Design a protein around this ligand. Sequence first.
Ligand SMILES: *CC(=O)N1N=C(c2ccccc2)C[C@@H]1c1cccc2nccnc12
Ligand SMILES: *CC(=O)N1N=C(c2ccccc2)C[C@@H]1c1cccc2nccnc12
Lengths: 305, 305
Amino acid sequence: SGFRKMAFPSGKVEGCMVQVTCGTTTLNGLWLDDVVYCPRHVICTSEDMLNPNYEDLLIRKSNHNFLVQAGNVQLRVIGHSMQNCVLKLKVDTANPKTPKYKFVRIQPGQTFSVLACYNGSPSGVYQCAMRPNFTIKGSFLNGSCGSVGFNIDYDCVSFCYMHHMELPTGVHAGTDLEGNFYGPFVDRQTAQAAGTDTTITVNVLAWLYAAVINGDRWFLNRFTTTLNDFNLVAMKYNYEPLTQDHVDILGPLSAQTGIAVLDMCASLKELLQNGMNGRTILGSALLEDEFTPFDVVRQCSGVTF
Amino acid sequence: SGFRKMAFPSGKVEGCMVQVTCGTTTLNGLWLDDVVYCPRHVICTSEDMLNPNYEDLLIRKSNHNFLVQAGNVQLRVIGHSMQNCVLKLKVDTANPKTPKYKFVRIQPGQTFSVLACYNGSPSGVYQCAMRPNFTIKGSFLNGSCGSVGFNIDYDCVSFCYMHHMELPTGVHAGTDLEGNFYGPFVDRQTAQAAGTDTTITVNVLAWLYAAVINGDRWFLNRFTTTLNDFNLVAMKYNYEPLTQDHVDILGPLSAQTGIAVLDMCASLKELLQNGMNGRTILGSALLEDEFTPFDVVRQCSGVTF
Ligand SMILES: *CC(=O)N1N=C(c2ccccc2)C[C@@H]1c1cccc2nccnc12
Ligand SMILES: *CC(=O)N1N=C(c2ccccc2)C[C@@H]1c1cccc2nccnc12
């Protein structure tokens, strides 16, 4: 049946993308009800980014200094305020295309879809995981600021990420929809450290179950292991330790395939210790950790929205 | 800046997905203007699929035997006809959400986005390439029939694929929007051969340019080669031969990076002959061929729709 990195349909989110301009700077905004959300660094010039004092920079700005455009229509700004690293522009008209929505702060290891935008217009959609070190490995060029990450539950869009910056290492950093950064990052053009990244062990195991469901079974060995013995091998390979919560979450995929979680752990241990020996799993020559146990189940059931 | 497998925004295509039922069989249809397009095997039972005579099976069906539903609204069917392996149901109302559209028959090696649907509702979106052997490696469960593939050019949606079946090998087969299968496949439950698959050489080269644009340069060697010498190595590795048309298409990426196409060919030759030696390129331990030279340029310019 196949297994792919699948993003959510983006239609409900396209209808919310606007263009926000403040002087020389243009970026993307999110229009829900009568409020437009965008990164607060829309108020900065290139020079201001070296060491910005956002409170002082914002005081020089009035409602008329912000131009919001949705399609070829100019929204009128009647209020402005800073909430952490997000700017909230109150507009005179509610978005008629506002979907049912929630703002959520996702956990490291969880996935979401990104609708990459430029000048308020969508260009593409792809799936991402929030790394354990709170960075994402996306595809974002200059102008993509304000692009959002989200998940869908039938009719409800849960927004979880807003793009703010690229670190000098090439990975991406951003905030939740309340303006709080994921990780220790700050909205300033200064060299910042993301820290050691680790592999999402529960996600690699979920992907091994999807491989068995789709006929790939070569990696299955005759060994089993214990949670502590496996974790001795996980720490050496910078893999996050496995806990009984992760084993419980893997329950449905273990019940569907007849393979106990600890037996799948022993196979992962031998893959970590001996490599793939020129072989592939689900069309990949690496161990994949950007698929949660939920993403595996959704793709095998055909859950719709 | 990053490089990802990015699908087109799916909003314009979600508005066209309907559910089509004929007796016991339900699948997805595409509603454009006053016509619904769906696989003709919507008229079959499971037993009929072993050896269907579509002309005889369709004669037993009248307009009232087809139920078309878009959301919770039942469209009235006022005409029906078979065009190759596609059924065309004329309805009494035009889709108010019909985008600007074209039907196109794509070439092997070209890419497109798939909006996987179940019961007329979208579940996800992902990018695919039409393999040189006219199969696709997608993610499709029972009920996904009628799901469509497409590309977007600013405001115009070009539909290129309709999902019809999975081969016993796990790969997927389907038609263009005129009902003509890509490849030698037929809509029957019989064992079918896809034939030897080859690697899209021009796509692997485009991906090597994107790697250099994003800082990955380790694979660049001090060698060059000729078109015929490279093709001697391509034939041995089941890679499609490179021609001056492919070299011309790679022109912009060669001009952007300062690396002649034939020098990138020599690097590909050494990667084919010596492997990756435990290293990765753009987060992959395999040579990627599902990105066209156009997909690389779009992702480095930020082209919007
Ligand atoms: C996310 C994004 O588009 N940008 N982030 C930028 C940044 C610069 C210094 C420190 C942190 C973040 C620059 C770039 C950007 C933002 C807003 C408007 C733009 N217009 C043109 C080009 N780049 C940008
Ligand atoms: C594409 C698709 O969903 N299906 N294709 C099927 C097929 C069977 C035999 C030979 C060729 C193709 C079966 C499956 C399907 C189609 C239509 C309705 C369904 N309802 C439930 C389950 N599967 C299907």
